[model samples]
Structures are given as C-alpha cells and as structure tokens.
Target: QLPNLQVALDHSNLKGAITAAVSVGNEVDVIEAGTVCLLQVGSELVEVLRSLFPDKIIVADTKCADAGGTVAKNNAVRGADWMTCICSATIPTMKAARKAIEDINPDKGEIQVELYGDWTYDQAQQWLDAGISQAIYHQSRTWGEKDLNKVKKLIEMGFRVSVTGGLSVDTLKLFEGVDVFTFIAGRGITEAKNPAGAARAFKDEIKRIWG
Candidate 1:
C-alpha cells in the first residue's frame, strides 16, 4: 500500500458501528471512532475497536478542546492510539494533551488536530513544531466544499495529512501531489451496500495516487 486508508465509524448506533467496522477493518489502516460514534459509544469505542482490530491504529475522534489533557488521558487509558484535538483549541490545551499522553509510554499517545472551524497555517506550524505533525484537513459535510488548493498548500508545508468529508470512490481522486497519512471515510464506507467493498475502492484509489 502507498498511503494508508482510514475508516471512521460514524454510526448513530453502537451495533451498526461495530458491524460495519468488522467488515472494513482489514482494508483500513486506522479505525477512527468518529465524534458521532463517540457521542453514542463514549470512550469505550476505542476499546471496542481495539478488541476488533488489535493491530490497527484506533483513533478516538474526541475533537477535544477544553481539558485537552484530561480528555486525552482518558482515551489513552481506554487504549486509543491516536486522539484528535480541534484546531480552535488553545495552544496550552494542545500541549496538555501531548504531555498527558507521554507517561503511558514513549510513543503511547499520538496527537492530530482535526482541521475544522478556524485556524491558520502559522497556527498549524506552531503545533507541528510542538510535536503535532498530523492533521485531518476536512471540509463541511453540508457545504460540499472541495478546496484542494488548501490541501495542496498544507501538504507542501510538510504536514502528514488525512483528507475526509464525505469522500466517495470517484471523489477520492481529487488529491494532488500529496501523500496522505490516511483517507478517513465515514458514510462512504458505513453507508455503502458493501462497506468492505467501499473501503477496498478507497484503498485502490489511494494506491493509484500514491504508488
């Protein structure tokens, strides 16, 4: 595989989330417990995904802002390999999360800022400089925005990127000279007639682009 593929478990119900995840887990590199799933499944979603895909990187998509350390520490305890923090959060909160996860093990907890709401390249650079090199440059699901230029510039700046926001098989072809750390798919995978097949399509597209 060239760039890794991620499937976000974004179901409203726990059973559906787990069921779909079990179908697509092998095709994905990261299993993200989306905020929607987390809102329903709580931090235990991390453990659930962990139990299902023990070797895959499980992300607790908490979109944590306040008490970042506390929130991150809880996810760490629950066995999440990556926890997403929001770009709108204070820098101190970001650092708190980074510091909070260290005691687990040297490389125990990894941090990524989900590129939502308000933020700037300078701010992203600050976070990148402070040990947060990963980011999810997502768009609004309702707006249906496709700002590839933003993604292009971000990748130019050396951030390990994950692109998401209702990405489908055809839509996945839009990425540029960028190598994504992963492509996070939610409805494109979980809502498909064949979730595993949908995930396989995503992986194929990534291979075509990055290989």
Candidate 2:
C-alpha cells in the first residue's frame, strides 16, 4: 500500500478534536484518538468520531501497557478500526490483542503495538513473527536519531512502520524511507492559532514532501 498520512488528534476537548479532524479529515487517511485523549474521554471520542466520519478509519491509541487483549477488545467492540498495544506487553497479551482484532474483523481491521524504545532488529523480527499487523518505532528520550534509524531499517526489512514522537513538518523529511507515516503532533497543530489551517497545511506539506 502507498504510505499513508494519519493525523493524531491529541487534544483534551471533544470539540477541538472533532474540529481539527474535520479540517484535515479529507486529506488524511486515518484519525488517531490519541492515548491521552482516549484515556480522558473514553470510547465516547471514538463513537462520536465514528458517527461523524463513518468512512474514515479510526484508531484508538489505548497504549495498552497491561491487559492488552482486554483494552483491544473494548476499543474494537466500540467500533475502533484499529487499536494499539505496547510491545513490552507480554507475548500472550500481544497474541490476544491480535486474535481479538481477527475475531472482530477477519480481514481489514488491525492491532498495532508499539515496539519498546531501543528494540533491536532481532526483537522486531520476533514481533513480525508473532503476527502483529503493525509496529511503531519511536525515539526514547535518550536515543533520538538512532531510534529513527532503527525504524528506517525495519521498514527496509518489510515491516509496516509508524514513526512517531516529537515529529514536526520541518522534520517530516527525516522519515523519508518509512513505509507508513503516522505523525503524532500535539502543540504542532492543535495548539496553533488556526488549528484547522495548521492541519491542512501539515497535510499539504506531507503530500508535497512525500510525493
């Protein structure tokens, strides 16, 4: 599949989240109900967005640290097209989450787990072998560029990669080799004076740079 652009709406308010999504929803391929948002607003955020944009794929970033399967099941049952789990989550937890996604939708839906920071190639291979649909490769507070390079390497190895953390329009080019680009912006767009315009501009910049 062609690399996709996912807009992360990490706001605390429902209106702000919806407005930002509505602004760039047409341009972006997926909408992420960010971890903080989902934790604060619960499935109501997912339901409201699902009601508004029935066609768009909505991902609940539950950030499953424990009971991965349970969290995934809850989100999937509530109409989430995708749900997240932490890679550090036990093997059984990851497997359960994947199974839950399969049970919910045999074909299209996905369960994404974040590969713990500082994961090695061997560890990523293990995740792929475990049948994970997607893996997010992100920087730890300490690793910075090295972490990014690790994710790029994984992409070259044919894993679906979501690059995140401290990303911005200016640094987007740093993700040039990534297969699926998911930008998790907080203040980058949501905190802007013109949030909608900021989102549109970000989408434009993504297309302009990537295409």
Query: Candidate 2's C-alpha lDDT?
Result: 0.73
Which digits, one per residue and each the tens of the lDDT, describe model 1 over residues 1-211?
4777888888888888888888889988888888898998788778888888888988889999889889989988878888899898788998898778666635647888988766788998898788887888876553132467677677788887888775777776666465667777877687789888888888887777777
Prediction 1 TM-score vs. true? 0.90
lDDT string, candidate 2, 1-211, tens digits: 4456677888877787878777667766678888878767787888777787878888988878777677777888877888888767766787788788678767556778776654567766666778874777665663357676777677776677777676666777766655555665555676678766776677777787666
Best candidate, TM-score: 1
Once superposed on the true structure, which residue ranges of model 2 sit more than 4 Å away at CA? 13-16, 140-145, 177-180
**Candidate models: Cα lDDT each:** 0.80, 0.73
Cα misplacement distance, residue 66 of candidate 2 (Å): 3.3
What range of 10 consecutive residues in model 1 has the weakest lDDT sum?
Answer: 139-148
Question: Candidate 1 overall Cα lDDT vs. reference?
Answer: 0.80
Against the correct fold, how does model 2 do in TM-score? 0.84
Residue pairs with clashing backbones, model 2: none
Q: Which candidate is the best by lDDT?
A: 1
Clashes of each: 0, 0
Per-residue lDDT for 74 in model 2? 82
